[PDB]
């Protein structure tokens, strides 16, 4: 992964810095490599970093020299699942395939499938992307979470 957006990577790297030493927490540099044009789960957000433990994740910060390995290991995702597979799979998931999924059931399979997101995570996902119906439209939902 090219060494020219190393500048952008250092930028956003220091963007979610807290120690303030050119060295950024691994969960923090992970949300960094997220908002660098990627969409990784906090799980892979951590694992891409040479697998830092939760201590290393938020205590041993990342020296930017090893953030160049991290930008490599995050640039594998760069985004998440296909939106046609999104729609067909959340249609077949939804018990009818109508076009939306219960905010109940969508927040469910967002906290009951894959990495169990914080319900604030599946909400800032779902809320802010809700249709006020309770069957939160995963189409609008997934897509504005995809762009945002």
């Amino acid at each position: 992964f090219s060494e020219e957006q190393t500048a952008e990577f250092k930028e956003a790297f220091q963007l979610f810095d807290r120690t303030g030493d050119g060295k950024i927490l691994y969960s923090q540099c992970g949300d960094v490599m997220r908002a660098l044009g990627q969409n990784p789960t906090n799980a892979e957000v951590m694992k891409v970093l040479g697998n830092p433990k939760s201590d290393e994740m938020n205590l041993k910060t990342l020296n930017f020299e090893q953030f160049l390995p991290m930008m490599q290991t995050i640039a594998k995702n760069k985004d998440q699942g296909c939106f046609e597979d999104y729609v067909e799979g959340l249609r077949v998931f939804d018990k009818e395939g109508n076009g939306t999924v219960m905010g109940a059931e969508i927040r469910h399979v967002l906290v009951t499938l894959g990495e169990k997101m914080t319900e604030e995570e599946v909400e800032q996902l779902v809320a802010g992307h809700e249709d006020s119906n309770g069957c939160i439209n995963y189409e609008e939902l997934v897509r504005m979470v995809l762009s945002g």
């Binding site: 077949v92 998931f93 018990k95 399979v109 009951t112 499938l113």
Partner: protein, 44 residues
């Protein structure tokens, strides 16, 4: 007929997971569940 509530049709009832939806690796696994028979999602 399918009446668990009526023992007049409970033996006639059909007790089973009714999901019939394209999601059953949310109540089960791809691993194939199963005389002396052991409902065994195929683990290895």
């Amino acid at each position: 007929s399918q009446k668990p509530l009526s023992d007049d049709e409970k033996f006639l009832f059909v007790d089973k997971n009714f999901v019939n939806n394209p999601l059953a690796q949310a109540d089960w696994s791809a691993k194939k569940l199963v005389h002396g028979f052991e409902a065994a999602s195929i683990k290895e």
